[PDB]
Ligand binder design. Structure first.
Ligand SMILES: Nc1nc2c(ncn2[C@@H]2O[C@H](COP(=O)(O)OP(=O)(O)OP(=O)(O)O)[C@@H](O)[C@H]2O)c(=O)[nH]1
Ligand SMILES: O=C([O-])C(=O)[O-]
Ligand SMILES: [Mn+2]
Ligand SMILES: [Mn+2]
Ligand code: NA
Ligand code: NA
Length: 608
């Protein structure tokens, strides 16, 4: 050059050390964003402890004195969740990203043109890191060096993101060494608050709500996120990369990237199988992935609780890996009763966001179901004193823990095996207060994809097909076609597909099923069905357990008639509702097989 060599500003590592393409990505975005310092993360314990202690000294995080190396971050309340309306995918044509709805608004993604995004980018990123450190985070999604793993580089101006990525991905120098001159996903993040601050800082939490924009450019292998320091907006490996970018990659390359837990279940005979399950956010993946089974002699072990990458191997087994390195789990509702294994995992080396703090340096949230000693007081996530009779919760309803996977006492022994675990069943499920029984089994692969397409969240109202509504990297119609195509992969060992419903209520709004560890009784049935056991009765919706097939010992107060009932009237409405939805939201891009399954279901219900 005659006068972008950023070597003078490197305060950890060396630009000369980086693979050539990594250096180009770092230096191009350094020129653009103008950070004061560049810190190439090494992923070391030393780095991490120093970063936490720094954040602590600035008032960005607090140490939770009751626990071993745990920390609390309280955000600006404007920055507390994924913002779906500010989350977009850029492609040349809108239809490649989302189907064109008849109601002029898609529920299945949000497209932005290249032109509009270029303008948005130029209005945000120039100079956005002034006065700050640009951290360079080399990370692997999946076990380091696994043939199913994929590497990214995230640039960020947030120490909180660096700490959380260290938990949620594999990151540091070993990733750079593994990468060499290979391809990587380019991830660029800024809290959007260059120094000197143009607006006041709220709760020591840098963010720019008005300019928040989480963009995905699958054709350029780029994720570009501005304005939010929170969770799925800032930890780019998780939703942005491992669902949105990865699902489109998966479609091109013949595999699947899904919003699924992966678990290993062992029966009293010592026989083990792996299952994957897609439930929408707020519908209990993490509880099932970590289940403490109530049934004696059974064991559940966790491979992952949120994302699965699955690819058929040479023998036709559908192999799954967890591309994450930790659990970014919802804190409220987590108790010894609902998730005892999570309670164990999170007492050390854990970062909590937006939960309450007790006066002895512990954590608190709605549904923790753990009384405090008299005199122990509570500071809410809004940093105000709080009492249990107050109108507001003590913790944000989407507050999280961020905890290392390897600490889970029931972590699966194969949770990092590079070839992945063989999936034998896929479970769909949602919140259905009425009509849908506790468990049913799909009649075929094509029926099972239809059943995934029919999933619901939020009290049985919102459609959330495959638990992917906020996460599709491309047109949902085409994703259906991709799933259906698996039936035609020669010698594929197609998993059995089930649908569960933990959430059926009686007329008074009481749950008909106790759930949590009692769900082990449902898993027992699925396990027997995969083994070929004659434990199923055919019904218009699929197979259900025979009378006496489920182990209900210890649960004699269960209303079996209501929990397992199938009403013609309910199912007529359901098929009409599904028809309207698929027409409104998918229309021209709906695969014929999905249409055929809808007709087949309608026809079976007509014969009741
Ligand atoms: N009634 C009942 N509720 C359950 C069961 N399992 C989980 N839940 C509820 O599920 C909610 C917690 O699920 P989340 O951790 O939000 O769900 P998730 O699928 O892990 O979501 P993300 O982490 O956002 O993907 C709480 O309201 C729990 O009470 C069950 O067996 N029965
Ligand atoms: O953070 C999550 O896991 C989610 O929102 O599904
Ligand atoms: Mn979860
Ligand atoms: Mn999730
Ligand atoms: Na704060
Ligand atoms: Na087919």
């Amino acid at each position: 050059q005659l006068h972008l060599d950023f070597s003078a500003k490197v305060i950890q590592g060396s630009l000369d050390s980086l693979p050539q393409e990594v250096r180009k990505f770092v230096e191009g975005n350094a020129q653009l964003c103008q950070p004061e310092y560049i810190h190439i993360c090494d992923g070391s314990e030393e780095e991490y402890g120093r970063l936490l202690a720094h954040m602590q000294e600035e008032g960005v995080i607090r140490k939770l004195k009751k626990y071993d190396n745990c920390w609390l971050a309280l955000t600006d309340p404007r920055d507390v969740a994924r913002i779906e309306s500010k989350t977009v995918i850029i492609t040349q044509e809108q239809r490649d990203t989302v189907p064109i709805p008849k109601s002029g608004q898609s529920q299945l993604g949000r497209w932005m043109s290249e032109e509009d995004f270029e303008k948005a980018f130029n209005a945000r990123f120039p100079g956005c890191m002034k006065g700050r450190t640009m951290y360079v985070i080399p990370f692997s999604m999946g076990p380091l060096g696994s043939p199913l793993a994929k590497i990214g580089i995230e640039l960020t101006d947030s120490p909180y993101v660096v700490a959380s990525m260290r938990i949620m991905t594999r990151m540091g120098t070993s990733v750079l060494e593994a990468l060499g001159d290979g391809e990587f996903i380019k991830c660029l993040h800024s809290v959007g608050c260059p120094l000197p601050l143009k607006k006041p800082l709220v709760n020591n939490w840098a963010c720019n709500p008005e300019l928040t924009l989480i963009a995905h450019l699958p054709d350029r292998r780029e994720i570009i996120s501005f304005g939010s320091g929170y969770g799925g907006n800032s930890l780019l490996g998780k939703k942005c990369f491992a669902l949105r970018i990865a699902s489109r990659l998966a479609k091109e390359e013949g595999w699947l990237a899904e919003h699924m837990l992966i678990l290993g279940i062992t029966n009293p005979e010592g026989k083990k199988k792996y299952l994957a399950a897609a439930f929408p956010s707020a519908c209990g993946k993490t509880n099932l992935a970590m289940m403490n089974p109530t049934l004696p002699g059974w064991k559940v072990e966790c491979v992952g609780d949120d994302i699965a990458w699955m690819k058929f191997d040479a023998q036709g087994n559908l192999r799954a890996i967890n591309p994450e390195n930790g659990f970014f789990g919802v804190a409220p509702g987590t108790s010894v009763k609902t998730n005892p294994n999570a309670i164990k995992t999170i007492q050390k080396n854990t970062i909590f966001t937006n939960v309450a703090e007790t006066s002895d340096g512990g954590v608190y949230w709605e549904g923790i179901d753990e009384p405090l000693a008299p005199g122990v007081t509570i500071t809410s996530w809004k940093n105000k004193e709080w009492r249990p009779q107050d109108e507001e919760p003590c913790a944000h309803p989407n507050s999280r823990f961020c905890t290392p996977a390897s600490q889970c006492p029931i972590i699966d022994p194969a949770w990092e095996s590079p070839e992945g675990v063989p999936i034998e069943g896929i479970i769909f499920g949602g919140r259905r207060p009425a009509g849908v029984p506790l468990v049913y089994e799909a009649l075929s692969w094509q029926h099972g994809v239809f059943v995934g397409a029919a999933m619901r969240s939020e009290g049985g109202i919102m459609h959330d097909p495959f638990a992917m509504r906020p996460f599709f990297g491309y047109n949902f119609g085409k994703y259906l076609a991709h799933w259906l195509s698996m039936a035609h992969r020669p010698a594929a060992k197609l998993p059995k597909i089930f649908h569960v419903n933990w959430f059926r209520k009686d007329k008074n709004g009481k749950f008909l099923w106790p759930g949590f560890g009692e769900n082990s009784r449902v898993l027992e049935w699925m396990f027997g069905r995969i083994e070929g056991e004659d434990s199923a009765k055919l019904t218009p919706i699929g197979y259900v357990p025979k009378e006496d097939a489920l182990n209900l010992k210890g649960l004699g107060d269960v209303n079996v008639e209501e929990l397992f009932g199938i009403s013609k009237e309910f199912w007529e409405k359901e098929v009409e509702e599904i028809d309207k939805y698929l027409e409104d939201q998918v229309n021209a891009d709906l695969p014929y097989e999905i249409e055929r399954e809808l007709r087949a279901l309608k026809q079976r219900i007509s014969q009741m």
